[PDB]
Amino acid sequence: HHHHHHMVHITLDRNTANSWLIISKDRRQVRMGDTHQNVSDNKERFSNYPMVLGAQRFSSGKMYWEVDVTQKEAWDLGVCRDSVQRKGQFSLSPENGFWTIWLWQDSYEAGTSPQTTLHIQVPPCQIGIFVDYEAGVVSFYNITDHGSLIYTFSECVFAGPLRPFFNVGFNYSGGNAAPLKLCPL
């Protein structure tokens, strides 16, 4: 792909984070803490899952960023509507305002309803995310495998401003403590 030139500098929005997340001082890395991180509750925080949004809002144009997923067992990545539900249980689906892929139990899947099996030969250490607002497109690229396509959501109905979306996953196993990191441009 030739999307690299639409690179945007993404930072994480503390105020949206689940109360167990630890966001680095530079707002470029996030990991699951082993306890509540001593923050007040607010209506923005994701309550049920280890999720956080980027601070940036996109309503037009072409945007590209990269995320490091090294050594993680489980995570979700993509974009979502600014108006997504924060409290209680929900599925990741375009009907609920999410355009995502994930790793879970040694398989990669796209967040369609129902979910779609992904075909990845080289487990990725870094993921590239491309959004074309006007075209209604969200695409995912395997940076570890020369930028090979993972998945394209097309005919997307964004229906509002979009925010970068992250889930570091639970760490019940003791094997998923590693952070998500926004990679330098």
Q: Which residues sit at the interface with ligand A1BFR, rule CB under 6 A?
A: 18, 20, 48, 170
* 20 or 90: CB nearest ligand A1BFR: 20
* 104 or 170: CB nearest ligand A1BFR: 170
Q: Which one-letter amino acid corresponds to residue 3? A: H
Query: Closest separation between CB of residue 99 and ligand A1BFR, Å?
Result: 23
Query: Closest separation between CB of residue 81 and ligand A1BFR, Å?
Result: 21
Query: Closest separation between CB of residue 20 and ligand A1BFR, Å?
Result: 4
* 5 or 36: CB nearest ligand A1BFR: 36
Nearest Cα neighbor of 80 from 68, 92, 91 is 92
Specify the pairing of strand 75-81 against strand 162-167.
antiparallel
* 18 or 142: CB nearest ligand A1BFR: 18
Closest residue to ligand A1BFR: CB criterion: 20
* 9 or 87: CB nearest ligand A1BFR: 87
Residues 6+ apart with CB under 8 A from 181: 28, 29, 67, 68
**Sign of the alpha-carbon dihedral angle for 47, 17, 69, 85:** positive
Place of tokens 């796209």: 110
Query: Closest separation between CB of residue 21 and ligand A1BFR, Å?
Result: 8
Q: Between the CA atoms of 116, 127, 27 and 49, what dihedral angle is there, to the nearest 10 degrees?
A: 20
**151 in helix, strand or coil?**
strand
Query: Closest separation between CB of residue 171 and ligand A1BFR, Å?
Result: 8
